[PDB]
Amino acid sequence: SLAVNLIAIDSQVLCGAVKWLILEKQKPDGVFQEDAPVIHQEMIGGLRNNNEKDMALTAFVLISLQEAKDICEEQVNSLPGSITKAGDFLEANYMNLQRSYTVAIAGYALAQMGRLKGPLLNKFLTTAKDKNRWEDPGKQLYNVEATSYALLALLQLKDFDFVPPVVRWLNEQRYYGGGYGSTQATFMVFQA
């Protein structure tokens, strides 16, 4: 979805993968299910953690489909209905989340649809600590990965009073990507 501005990605194949994900790899209630995890388990980052895995995997694919919505909106007419089912599932079980990583990635998915409001928005804000990061206990690699999703959520919500401390904290980390198990952390931080 990012490389359509750089190289000629085939629209039929791209939307064919979207149609395959909607029809084959989506449960009727909105949950996306993976039937073959990748061999390299270090490239998935924080999604390797099996706690609250079903909610996090659903939000990851929902974000990917919404970013490719403009290209395959005309190709697949069931794309908005698929997003609606996934949004209702995430919205109903949003308040039960505990991990800061899961809340951050779900916040950006809900913010694109416009459902991150009220108590869901209050939970998203209070999840941050020191008003500049969304951190979980463990390696810094996962915390920067989670913070990248939340920074994109603030830009989606168009609330910039809280953004400068977040961006200032990211530069203070001096993270330059790369390294064993850095695929998701390196890719999302520079997108933000």
PDB file of all heavy atoms in Angstrom, residues 168-182:
ATOM      1  N   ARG A 168       9.301  14.019  20.702  1.00  0.00           N
ATOM      2  CA  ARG A 168      10.539  14.375  21.389  1.00  0.00           C
ATOM      3  C   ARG A 168      11.106  13.183  22.150  1.00  0.00           C
ATOM      4  O   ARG A 168      12.329  13.013  22.230  1.00  0.00           O
ATOM      5  CB  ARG A 168      10.291  15.549  22.334  1.00  0.00           C
ATOM      6  CG  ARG A 168      11.539  16.089  23.010  1.00  0.00           C
ATOM      7  CD  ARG A 168      11.228  17.364  23.773  1.00  0.00           C
ATOM      8  NE  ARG A 168      10.714  18.411  22.893  1.00  0.00           N
ATOM      9  CZ  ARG A 168      10.383  19.632  23.297  1.00  0.00           C
ATOM     10  NH1 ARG A 168      10.507  19.967  24.574  1.00  0.00           N
ATOM     11  NH2 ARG A 168       9.925  20.519  22.425  1.00  0.00           N
ATOM     12  N   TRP A 169      10.233  12.349  22.719  1.00  0.00           N
ATOM     13  CA  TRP A 169      10.688  11.156  23.425  1.00  0.00           C
ATOM     14  C   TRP A 169      11.276  10.128  22.465  1.00  0.00           C
ATOM     15  O   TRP A 169      12.229   9.424  22.812  1.00  0.00           O
ATOM     16  CB  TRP A 169       9.532  10.550  24.223  1.00  0.00           C
ATOM     17  CG  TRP A 169       9.899   9.307  24.975  1.00  0.00           C
ATOM     18  CD1 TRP A 169      10.420   9.233  26.234  1.00  0.00           C
ATOM     19  CD2 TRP A 169       9.761   7.956  24.518  1.00  0.00           C
ATOM     20  NE1 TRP A 169      10.621   7.920  26.587  1.00  0.00           N
ATOM     21  CE2 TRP A 169      10.224   7.116  25.551  1.00  0.00           C
ATOM     22  CE3 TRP A 169       9.294   7.375  23.336  1.00  0.00           C
ATOM     23  CZ2 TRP A 169      10.233   5.729  25.437  1.00  0.00           C
ATOM     24  CZ3 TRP A 169       9.304   5.997  23.225  1.00  0.00           C
ATOM     25  CH2 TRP A 169       9.770   5.189  24.269  1.00  0.00           C
ATOM     26  N   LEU A 170      10.721  10.028  21.254  1.00  0.00           N
ATOM     27  CA  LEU A 170      11.235   9.067  20.282  1.00  0.00           C
ATOM     28  C   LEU A 170      12.648   9.421  19.836  1.00  0.00           C
ATOM     29  O   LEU A 170      13.497   8.534  19.689  1.00  0.00           O
ATOM     30  CB  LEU A 170      10.298   8.989  19.079  1.00  0.00           C
ATOM     31  CG  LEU A 170       8.905   8.420  19.348  1.00  0.00           C
ATOM     32  CD1 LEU A 170       8.021   8.565  18.122  1.00  0.00           C
ATOM     33  CD2 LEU A 170       8.996   6.964  19.774  1.00  0.00           C
ATOM     34  N   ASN A 171      12.920  10.709  19.611  1.00  0.00           N
ATOM     35  CA  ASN A 171      14.271  11.117  19.240  1.00  0.00           C
ATOM     36  C   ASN A 171      15.256  10.907  20.382  1.00  0.00           C
ATOM     37  O   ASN A 171      16.429  10.602  20.137  1.00  0.00           O
ATOM     38  CB  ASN A 171      14.275  12.577  18.786  1.00  0.00           C
ATOM     39  CG  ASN A 171      13.524  12.783  17.484  1.00  0.00           C
ATOM     40  OD1 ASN A 171      13.282  11.835  16.737  1.00  0.00           O
ATOM     41  ND2 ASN A 171      13.155  14.028  17.204  1.00  0.00           N
ATOM     42  N   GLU A 172      14.806  11.067  21.630  1.00  0.00           N
ATOM     43  CA  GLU A 172      15.676  10.822  22.774  1.00  0.00           C
ATOM     44  C   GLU A 172      16.054   9.353  22.916  1.00  0.00           C
ATOM     45  O   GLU A 172      17.095   9.049  23.508  1.00  0.00           O
ATOM     46  CB  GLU A 172      15.006  11.306  24.061  1.00  0.00           C
ATOM     47  CG  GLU A 172      14.974  12.815  24.228  1.00  0.00           C
ATOM     48  CD  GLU A 172      14.248  13.243  25.488  1.00  0.00           C
ATOM     49  OE1 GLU A 172      14.887  13.284  26.560  1.00  0.00           O
ATOM     50  OE2 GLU A 172      13.034  13.528  25.409  1.00  0.00           O
ATOM     51  N   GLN A 173      15.234   8.440  22.390  1.00  0.00           N
ATOM     52  CA  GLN A 173      15.577   7.023  22.435  1.00  0.00           C
ATOM     53  C   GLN A 173      16.759   6.702  21.529  1.00  0.00           C
ATOM     54  O   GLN A 173      17.526   5.775  21.818  1.00  0.00           O
ATOM     55  CB  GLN A 173      14.366   6.175  22.045  1.00  0.00           C
ATOM     56  CG  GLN A 173      13.144   6.397  22.922  1.00  0.00           C
ATOM     57  CD  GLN A 173      13.477   6.382  24.401  1.00  0.00           C
ATOM     58  OE1 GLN A 173      13.873   5.354  24.949  1.00  0.00           O
ATOM     59  NE2 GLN A 173      13.323   7.528  25.052  1.00  0.00           N
ATOM     60  N   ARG A 174      16.917   7.457  20.441  1.00  0.00           N
ATOM     61  CA  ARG A 174      17.980   7.249  19.456  1.00  0.00           C
ATOM     62  C   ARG A 174      17.957   5.819  18.920  1.00  0.00           C
ATOM     63  O   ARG A 174      18.954   5.094  18.962  1.00  0.00           O
ATOM     64  CB  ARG A 174      19.354   7.589  20.040  1.00  0.00           C
ATOM     65  CG  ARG A 174      19.674   9.073  20.087  1.00  0.00           C
ATOM     66  CD  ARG A 174      21.062   9.304  20.665  1.00  0.00           C
ATOM     67  NE  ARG A 174      21.156   8.884  22.061  1.00  0.00           N
ATOM     68  CZ  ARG A 174      20.867   9.661  23.099  1.00  0.00           C
ATOM     69  NH1 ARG A 174      20.461  10.907  22.904  1.00  0.00           N
ATOM     70  NH2 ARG A 174      20.984   9.190  24.334  1.00  0.00           N
ATOM     71  N   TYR A 175      16.797   5.413  18.415  1.00  0.00           N
ATOM     72  CA  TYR A 175      16.610   4.094  17.830  1.00  0.00           C
ATOM     73  C   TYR A 175      16.787   4.198  16.322  1.00  0.00           C
ATOM     74  O   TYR A 175      16.125   5.015  15.672  1.00  0.00           O
ATOM     75  CB  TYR A 175      15.228   3.535  18.176  1.00  0.00           C
ATOM     76  CG  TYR A 175      14.934   2.187  17.558  1.00  0.00           C
ATOM     77  CD1 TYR A 175      15.499   1.027  18.070  1.00  0.00           C
ATOM     78  CD2 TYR A 175      14.080   2.075  16.469  1.00  0.00           C
ATOM     79  CE1 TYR A 175      15.229  -0.207  17.510  1.00  0.00           C
ATOM     80  CE2 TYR A 175      13.802   0.846  15.903  1.00  0.00           C
ATOM     81  CZ  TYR A 175      14.380  -0.292  16.427  1.00  0.00           C
ATOM     82  OH  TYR A 175      14.107  -1.517  15.864  1.00  0.00           O
ATOM     83  N   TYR A 176      17.678   3.376  15.767  1.00  0.00           N
ATOM     84  CA  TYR A 176      18.018   3.455  14.351  1.00  0.00           C
ATOM     85  C   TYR A 176      17.610   2.203  13.585  1.00  0.00           C
ATOM     86  O   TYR A 176      18.111   1.966  12.482  1.00  0.00           O
ATOM     87  CB  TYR A 176      19.512   3.729  14.184  1.00  0.00           C
ATOM     88  CG  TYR A 176      19.930   5.056  14.772  1.00  0.00           C
ATOM     89  CD1 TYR A 176      20.581   5.122  15.995  1.00  0.00           C
ATOM     90  CD2 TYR A 176      19.646   6.245  14.115  1.00  0.00           C
ATOM     91  CE1 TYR A 176      20.951   6.336  16.541  1.00  0.00           C
ATOM     92  CE2 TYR A 176      20.014   7.464  14.650  1.00  0.00           C
ATOM     93  CZ  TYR A 176      20.666   7.504  15.864  1.00  0.00           C
ATOM     94  OH  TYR A 176      21.036   8.716  16.401  1.00  0.00           O
ATOM     95  N   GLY A 177      16.712   1.399  14.144  1.00  0.00           N
ATOM     96  CA  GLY A 177      16.198   0.242  13.441  1.00  0.00           C
ATOM     97  C   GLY A 177      17.241  -0.848  13.276  1.00  0.00           C
ATOM     98  O   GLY A 177      18.385  -0.745  13.716  1.00  0.00           O
ATOM     99  N   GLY A 178      16.817  -1.923  12.617  1.00  0.00           N
ATOM    100  CA  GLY A 178      17.685  -3.066  12.422  1.00  0.00           C
ATOM    101  C   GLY A 178      17.938  -3.855  13.691  1.00  0.00           C
ATOM    102  O   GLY A 178      17.697  -3.369  14.800  1.00  0.00           O
ATOM    103  N   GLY A 179      18.422  -5.075  13.537  1.00  0.00           N
ATOM    104  CA  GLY A 179      18.706  -5.946  14.655  1.00  0.00           C
ATOM    105  C   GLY A 179      17.810  -7.174  14.658  1.00  0.00           C
ATOM    106  O   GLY A 179      16.755  -7.220  14.018  1.00  0.00           O
ATOM    107  N   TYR A 180      18.252  -8.184  15.404  1.00  0.00           N
ATOM    108  CA  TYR A 180      17.500  -9.427  15.518  1.00  0.00           C
ATOM    109  C   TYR A 180      16.122  -9.156  16.109  1.00  0.00           C
ATOM    110  O   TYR A 180      16.003  -8.655  17.231  1.00  0.00           O
ATOM    111  CB  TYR A 180      18.276 -10.424  16.378  1.00  0.00           C
ATOM    112  CG  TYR A 180      17.458 -11.597  16.871  1.00  0.00           C
ATOM    113  CD1 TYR A 180      17.089 -12.623  16.008  1.00  0.00           C
ATOM    114  CD2 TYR A 180      17.071 -11.688  18.201  1.00  0.00           C
ATOM    115  CE1 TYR A 180      16.347 -13.699  16.457  1.00  0.00           C
ATOM    116  CE2 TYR A 180      16.329 -12.760  18.658  1.00  0.00           C
ATOM    117  CZ  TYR A 180      15.970 -13.763  17.782  1.00  0.00           C
ATOM    118  OH  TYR A 180      15.231 -14.835  18.232  1.00  0.00           O
ATOM    119  N   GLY A 181      15.083  -9.489  15.347  1.00  0.00           N
ATOM    120  CA  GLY A 181      13.718  -9.254  15.770  1.00  0.00           C
ATOM    121  C   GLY A 181      13.338  -7.787  15.783  1.00  0.00           C
ATOM    122  O   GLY A 181      12.763  -7.294  16.758  1.00  0.00           O
ATOM    123  N   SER A 182      13.662  -7.076  14.704  1.00  0.00           N
ATOM    124  CA  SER A 182      13.393  -5.647  14.590  1.00  0.00           C
ATOM    125  C   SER A 182      12.486  -5.304  13.415  1.00  0.00           C
ATOM    126  O   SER A 182      12.370  -4.124  13.068  1.00  0.00           O
ATOM    127  CB  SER A 182      14.704  -4.871  14.463  1.00  0.00           C
ATOM    128  OG  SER A 182      15.393  -5.257  13.286  1.00  0.00           O
TER     129      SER A 182
END
